[PDB]
Amino acid sequence: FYKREMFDPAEKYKMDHRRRGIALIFNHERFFWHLTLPERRGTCADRDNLTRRFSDLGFEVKCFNDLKAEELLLKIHEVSTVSHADADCFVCVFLSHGEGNHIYAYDAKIEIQTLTGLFKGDKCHSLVGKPKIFIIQAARGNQHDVPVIPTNITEVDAASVYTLPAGADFLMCYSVAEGYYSHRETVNGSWYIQDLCEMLGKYGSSLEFTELLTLVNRKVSQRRVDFCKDPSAIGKKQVPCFASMLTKKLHFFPKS
Amino acid sequence: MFDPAEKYKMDHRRRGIALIFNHERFFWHLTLPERRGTCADRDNLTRRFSDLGFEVKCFNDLKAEELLLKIHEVSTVSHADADCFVCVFLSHGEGNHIYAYDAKIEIQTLTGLFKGDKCHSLVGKPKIFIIQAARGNQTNITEVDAASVYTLPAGADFLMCYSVAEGYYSHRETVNGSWYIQDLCEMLGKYGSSLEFTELLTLVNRKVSQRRVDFCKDPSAIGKKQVPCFASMLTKKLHFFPK
Ligand SMILES: O=c1[nH]c(N2CCCC2)cc2ccccc12
């Protein structure tokens, strides 16, 4: 007995490589004054939470704090051009503000398509047919701060980043969809990342990953702020979403 | 308590309504090409959704006002006895817009009609939009159109399903129908009644993206790959087990 090359309704990505793969985390807390963007207190909690969860799944995690755009591009270009032949998959997380198709680095914005395009096709042959998962916590920075050089609070940011797709075997995960609001607690971190990390810890090692993202959708969409603490946060619901171009089931069973 | 495997309750008296808006021809002033093969798509979809328990309603070449009127009428009736709601658009599109016969309509206007405040009886139920719409180029022939419609998200418990993502190309056979719709219907027929629906959509991703573009009867279409996508805001597992 063997498996003939017949359409399998339950096909899974092969997750038996020597290594799980790299998980990149781009963490942005502060921005060049000329961008007139507010700080993102709580993002370091998000970064740490993610590092622990992804590391327990076998990923090699690399974090970068407050990179300038050129440095960021350089770093991601460097990761895209090495061999991922011995890896199962690739994860890239952006924790920043954003606008439309753009994510903000420290000093400038970068087009998302530019970042994902580095891992397409034969630009990165050794990731072809492997899951390429981008996780994006980025929304509109509230701008009631000046264009001049300069306790757990929940900050509420309007969705601003387009929920773009990205190519075969890409999975694009967004903290929030158009019309909704992203929330970040200044000590505990983002609603989305907290709930993502909690599900990863509890179910990451067995649950099909888009099914886990669906759990995150439910958890986040059911959260309520105070109403005593911020009353105008009243009514600003958060609905995450994910755009999948995956072609197989994705699991993170513990590597043998 | 929290259930990691919770499913939408698909227990209601009826499965629900599946609306199909089918556009084959457009008013001359729009200068859009005909969509031969779309009638096969309409028929294929009707059979699949009907076998899944859906009350299917098809409308061919409605003008924008008629289309808006019809979908508003559907959004304002009670879906209290229904499991869910499906809406399919077969047309050309651009950005945020899908073409009716005479004019374009914003997708957000269409999905907004079924958001919780506007449609109480669908709150907490899957609302599934399937969109075969790309850029109209201005015996079985394969037509190849550039992706043009933004892969928009919609609200909680919406699932937005797109024939093609930015950078890729949608294909339609004049006799057999669209690649995306053909593969979707094929999967619906074999696995619709058992497989979790986003897992089924993943199969469709695989099926469409593996269709070779190496040797086209039209050398111009060589290398113009199709990759679909879906944007999920579902909050539970979705199955269409026989009612
Ligand atoms: O490219 C996109 N543009 C836009 N917009 C440009 C016009 C305003 C929205 C929205 C979107 C959403 C999901 C996926 C892609 C897109």
> Of the residues A162, A172, A242, which should be mutated to test ligand 1's pocket, given the most ligand atoms within 8 Å of the CB?
A162
> If you search the block for the tokens 């958001």, which residue do you land on?
B115
**Cα–Cα distances in angstroms (integers) from residue B83 to residues B12, B14, B78, in the given order:** 6, 7, 12
**C-alpha torsion sign, points B2, B7, B8, B12:** negative
Question: In ligand 1, which atom is closest to the CA atom of B152?
Answer: 13
CA of A3 to the centre of ligand 1 (A): 42
Q: Does B59 touch chain A (CB under 8 A)?
A: no
CB within 8 Å of A88: residues ≥ 6 apart: A13, A14, A15, A16, A17, A19, A20, A21, A130, A131
Nearest to A199 by CA among A135, A155, A138: A135
Task: Measure the N-to-C terminal CA separation of chain A; round to a whole number of Å.
Answer: 24
Distance CA(A230)–CA(A144), nearest Å, equals: 17
Per CB-CB distance under 8 Å, the chain B contacts of A179 are: 155
Q: What's the burial of B9, exposed, middle or buried (CB within 10 Å: 0-12/13-18/19+)?
A: exposed
> If you search the block for the tokens 């497989």, which residue do you land on?
B195
Nearest to B170 by CA among B204, B141, B194, B143: B143
Give the tokens for residue B60. 């061919």
Q: What's the burial of A146, exposed, middle or buried (CB within 10 Å: 0-12/13-18/19+)?
A: exposed
CB B131 within 8 A of CB B162: yes
> Of the residues B149, B150, B164, which should be mutated to test ligand 1's pocket, given the most ligand atoms within 8 Å of the CB?
B150
Q: What's the burial of A166, exposed, middle or buried (CB within 10 Å: 0-12/13-18/19+)?
A: buried
Among the partner residues A215, A239, A246, nearest to B202 by beta-carbon distance: A246
SS3 A41: coil
CB A94 within 8 A of CB A135: yes
**Side chain identity at residue A127, one-letter code:** L
CA of A18 to the centre of ligand 1 (A): 38
In order of their start, the domains of chain B are: 1-243 (3.40.50.1460)
CA of B232 to the centre of ligand 1 (A): 16
Distance CA(B75)–CA(B34), nearest Å, equals: 29
Ligand 1 interacting residues, C-beta cut-off 6 A: A 162-164; B 150-152
Per CB-CB distance under 8 Å, the chain A contacts of B180 are: none
What resolution in angstrom units was achieved for this structure?
2.1
Parallel, antiparallel or unpaired: strands A154-158 and A181-185: antiparallel
Nearest to B55 by CA among B24, B89, B79: B79
Mutate to test the interface with B, among A112, A128, A245 (most CBs of B within 10 A): A245
The DSSP code for B116 is T
Give the tokens for residue B130. 């399937």
CA of A98 to the centre of ligand 1 (A): 13
CB A236 within 8 A of CB A221: no
Distance CA(B187)–CA(B182), nearest Å, equals: 9
Distance CA(B20)–CA(A32), nearest Å, equals: 50
Distance CA(B162)–CA(B152), nearest Å, equals: 9
Residue of A nearest to B231 (CA): A243
Taking CB atoms and an 8 Å limit, are B229 and A242 in contact across chains? Answer: no
Q: Does B213 touch chain A (CB under 8 A)?
A: no
> If you search the block for the tokens 């499906």, which residue do you land on?
B86
CB A12 within 8 A of CB A250: yes
Taking CB atoms and an 8 Å limit, are A241 and B162 in contact across chains? Answer: no
**C-alpha torsion sign, points A243, A247, A252, A255:** negative
> If you search the block for the tokens 């009716």, which residue do you land on?
B100
Count A/B contacts: CB-CB distance under 8 Å.
Answer: 109
Nearest to A163 by CA among A184, A179, A142: A179
Distance CA(A118)–CA(A109), nearest Å, equals: 17
Taking CB atoms and an 8 Å limit, are B235 and A214 in contact across chains? Answer: yes
H helices, E strands: number in chain B: 5, 11
Distance CA(A159)–CA(A173), nearest Å, equals: 14
SS3 B124: coil
Nearest to A170 by CA among A207, A208, A120: A120
CA of A163 to the centre of ligand 1 (A): 7
**C-alpha torsion sign, points A179, A185, A189, A195:** negative
Per CB-CB distance under 8 Å, the chain A contacts of B226 are: none
